[PDB]
Amino acid sequence: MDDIYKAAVEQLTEEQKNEFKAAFDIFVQGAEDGCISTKELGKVMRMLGQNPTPEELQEMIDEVDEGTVDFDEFLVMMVRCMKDDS
Ligand SMILES: [Ca+2]
């Protein structure tokens, strides 16, 4: 895994990582596919209680993308968004 991504992922509990993977898995044909689309990214995040805005999703795709989001990118984006709660 990318070392910076570890900055983010180390913030997650094991319970969180498992919950987040189960949510991500809803949005892929797991037998064939490892990424969700950029529209689905907002959906999985919202499934986990986050509410990213449309500008934010594009920014996150610009900054964290290594169109498509794999599981570790998704985790980093979750961590980012988790930190904008008020
Ligand atoms: Ca839990």
Contact 45, 13 (CB under 8 A): no
Within 8 A by CB and 6+ apart from 84, the residues are none
Instruction: Please give the distance of CA 5 from its chain centroid, rounded to a whole number.
Output: 12
Give me ligand 1 centre to Cα 48, in Å.
11
Assign 54 to helix, strand or coil: helix
The annotation status of 13 as a binding-site residue, yes or no, is: no
Assign 23 to helix, strand or coil: helix
Task: Report the largest interatomic distance among the alpha carbons of the chain, rounded to a whole angstrom.
Answer: 38
Experimental method, per PDB record? X-ray
CA–CA separation, 66 vs 86, rounded Å? 29
The annotation status of 38 as a binding-site residue, yes or no, is: no
